[PDB]
Amino acid sequence: AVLNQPSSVSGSLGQRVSITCSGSSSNVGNGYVSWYQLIPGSAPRTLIYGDTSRASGVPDRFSGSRSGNTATLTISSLQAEDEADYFCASAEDSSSNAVFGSGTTLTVLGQPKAAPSVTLFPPSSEELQANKATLVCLISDFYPGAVTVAWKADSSPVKAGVETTTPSKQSNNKYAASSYLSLTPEQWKSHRSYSCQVTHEGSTVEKTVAPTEC
Amino acid sequence: KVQLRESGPSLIKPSQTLSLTCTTSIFSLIDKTVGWVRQAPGKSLEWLGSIDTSGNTGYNPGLKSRLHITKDNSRSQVSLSLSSVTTADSATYYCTTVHQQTRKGCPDGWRFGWDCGFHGYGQEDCYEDCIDILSSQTLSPTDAYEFHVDAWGQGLLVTVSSASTKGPSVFPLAPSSKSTSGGTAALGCLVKDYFPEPVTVSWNSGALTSGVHTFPAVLQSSGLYSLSSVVTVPSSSLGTQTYICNVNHKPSNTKVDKKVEPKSC
């Protein structure tokens, strides 16, 4: 089984949202619902147990309730660091047969936007001497967490050999992403330059590197 | 910070039996129940099973056939096994301390006599009507099952695949004259061509944490992963302060310390 949750909820910064957990009498209706917070890159964190009790270190703005077969996690004074996946849980016919909900991704609206900083690294001398070459475009400190990356060799768009990560949150709650262009040392040295172009909210930042430099 | 620590292979071939163990007695294995929870990429948390001070075991009904959980309070190790794994079993496996126990409860809308405020014989029973209690419908309490995870381990990533382990190659991402940002500069390490996940990165053995971001990995058409770790540092320090990235690839029992030297222009 799996408890039913909305896949996505959106709350505004400083306001309140509720995450719903709908089950049945054999689980949610048994009266001991727990909640869990999962931030990418960290281990899960217990928030609520026994429908309403906060775990050690859980602020007061996190509150849990239940009405029959439906439980609710209400978060007030939303902060950016509340963005995470939230799961409910309940025993079922046994305190050792636990069932979790499908999970809810919380987005906090109204956060301040930020244009990305881009640093393009050329292939290292060490990598070239190992007969490989990787251009590394690092993109950081932007919000919202969505960008598109394009590469050029001299002025020719480059399609093959590009790998780009989906943006993820930094420690300061802004987003970062990375893009890679694999080349041969001969391709690197043959062209006069390479560029990484990052588009974010209708604007584009381009960084260029040349083999004739450091 | 005291933790629960999972151990086991990071890579297992299809069909083999994933064997894990959790080892920590500071969370008294003699006075705390240990459970196992997993999460596969893009899926929700999934219960596996538990075992308490006694050896009482409870299993996820849908998976109990392939699951076996034992312990050794001697070595203070709870150990889980999962037979006939498939790619659907690639996931993070978490060791946890868990609160389980059956308690007597009343149906929703009912309260125990003593909770209603009645003292005397019949106070331990459940009552539909706390006000006119002497004529209230009454029930003997029923079992209410209580569960919640109390402590979470950091988790062990397990990849089910026929491909072979490969340690990383680490290259410097050195800062240069045109690549600075005034007072600060970005430098990092490229962690190239490893399998399976995960890789972790620290800087100067953990002493440097301000400004550090380790990116998620990319999966290349080669089937190998690469990632980068970056740190923003004072531009005036380049040359005097040594910067060393500490790369850990537990799946291959590899650690790399790479000094990132600044470029001479």
Residue numbers in the entry:
A (entry chain L): 2 to 9, 11 to 27, 27A, 27B, 28 to 95, 95A, 95B, 96 to 106, ...
B (entry chain H): 1 to 82, 82A, 82B, 82C, 83 to 262
Report text from the authors:
The cow antibody repertoire contains a unique subset (~10%) of antibodies possessing ultralong CDRH3s, which can reach lengths between 50 to 70 amino acids. The unique CDRH3 structure can be separated into two microdomains where the antigen-binding disulfide-bound “knob” sits on top of a long b-ribbon “stalk” and can bind to both surface and receded epitopes. Ultimately, we isolated a total of 8 and 11 cross-clade nAbs from cow-485 and cow-488, respectively, all of which had ultralong CDRH3s, suggesting only ultralong antibodies were responsible for cross-clade neutralization detected in sera. BnAbs from cow-485 were named Bess, while bnAbs from cow-488 were named ElsE and assigned numbers based on their order of discovery.
The ElsE Fabs all have CDRH3s with 54 amino acids and 4 cysteines, with a 1–3, 2–4 connectivity, Bess7 has a 61-amino acid CDRH3 with 8 cysteines (1–6, 2–5, 3–7, 4–8 connectivity), while the 55-amino acid CDRH3 knob region for Bess 4 (6 Cys, 1–3, 2–5, 4–6 connectivity) has no ordered electron density in the crystal structure. Ultralong bovine CDRH3 knob regions fold with 3 short β-strands connected by 2 loops (Loop1, Loop2) of varying lengths that can adopt a multitude of different secondary structures, including loops, helices and β-turns. The ElsE series of Fabs all have highly similar knob structures as expected from their high sequence similarity. Flexibility in the stalk is evident in a comparison of the ElsE family of structures that have similar CDRH3 knob sequences and structures, but very different orientations of knob domains with respect to the body of the Fab. The ability of the knobs to twist and rotate with respect to the body of the Fab likely enhances the ability of bovine Fabs to access recessed epitopes. There is no convincing electron density to indicate tyrosine sulfation modifications in any of the antibody CDRH3 regions; however, BLI experiments indicate that Bess7, with 3 tyrosines in CDRH3, contains one or more sulfated tyrosines. Low sulfate occupancy or flexibility in the CDRH3 knob region may explain the lack of electron density for these groups. We chose Bess1, Bess2, Bess4, ElsE1, and ElsE2 mAbs as representatives to be tested on 98 viruses from a large cross-clade panel. The ElsE lineage was the most potent and broad overall.
